[PDB]
Design a protein around this nucleic acid. Structure first.
Lengths: 102, 138
DNA sequence: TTTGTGGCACTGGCCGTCGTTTCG
DNA sequence: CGAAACGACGGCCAGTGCCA
């Protein structure tokens, strides 16, 4: 349902911060927001995701074991040149447009 | 909730106005309001879902008992705004007094002052370049 | 032969285990 | 004498570089 729902559910143990970055860059998480906004919100929501577990890992359940995800931390939209540069990094090929077509 | 997901910086921050359907800005919630209206509806139809909220007291359930008689923004295009060596030049007002061409440029000029140049800033292409061209038929 | 590609080995970053040293 | 807590180190995974 969200980036937070993705982080608290799949821990850093499994999907590490290095993997999460390119997963945003490749476009796998585009259904939750802007790439720049998502990338920025990684480490804050990661701390929040790790914080949600220890609430459940010492009593509590949901309402008191989870202060629901905060809004996505704001950032400027990426330009196509630096956006398509991340797609090549994340997928090994210029997926979805070539920088020259701008 | 698909429009809330598209959020990019302050873009959807200044998007509830573009809908609009508010009351003189913001009575009740850190709106959007269009996130409480589908929740009231629920799923797609479904009568338990519309009813639920109705028993306690998409678009026309909202029209029933809600703050509507105010009118702020319109489109979808309306704006407003979202307020709640060569350079220009000469000087500068606006409207422009050295360039520029003649539609939707003043608006840019209007926005501009001041005072960096370049820089370029999103990302390219023209602006300094065009200025250069004019300093160029001096 | 001068180019690209697919497999496999090497480094670094993080993580979790084990062993030692200290304190009670 | 035994428990704990801190630091070392392996290895594991991944990102890379090479060579066939």
């Amino acid at each position: 349902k969200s980036l937070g729902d993705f982080l608290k559910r799949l821990p850093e143990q499994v999907v590490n911060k290095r993997a999460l970055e390119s997963l945003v860059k490749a476009g796998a998480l585009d259904a939750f927001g802007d790439r720049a906004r998502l990338l920025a919100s990684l480490e804050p929501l990661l701390r929040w995701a790790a914080e949600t577990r220890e609430r459940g890992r010492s009593g509590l359940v949901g309402l008191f074991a989870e202060v629901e995800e905060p809004p996505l931390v704001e950032a400027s939209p990426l330009d196509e040149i630096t956006m398509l540069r991340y797609e090549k990094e994340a997928l090994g090929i210029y997926v979805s447009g070539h920088p020259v077509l701008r | 909730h698909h429009h809330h997901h598209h959020k990019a910086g302050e873009a959807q921050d200044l998007a509830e106005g573009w809908r609009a359907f508010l009351e003189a800005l913001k009575p009740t919630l850190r709106a959007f309001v269009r996130e409480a209206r589908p929740h009231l509806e629920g799923k797609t139809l479904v009568l338990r879902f519309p009813e639920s909220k109705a028993f306690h007291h998409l678009l026309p359930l909202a029209r029933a008992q809600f703050g509507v008689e105010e009118l702020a923004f319109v489109l979808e295009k309306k704006s407003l705004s979202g307020a709640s060596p060569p350079w220009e030049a000469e000087e500068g007002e606006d409207p422009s007094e050295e360039l520029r061409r003649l539609a939707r440029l003043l608006g840019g000029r209007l926005l501009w002052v001041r005072k960096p140049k370049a820089p370029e800033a999103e990302e390219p292409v023209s602006e300094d370049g065009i200025g250069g061209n004019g300093i160029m038929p001096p």
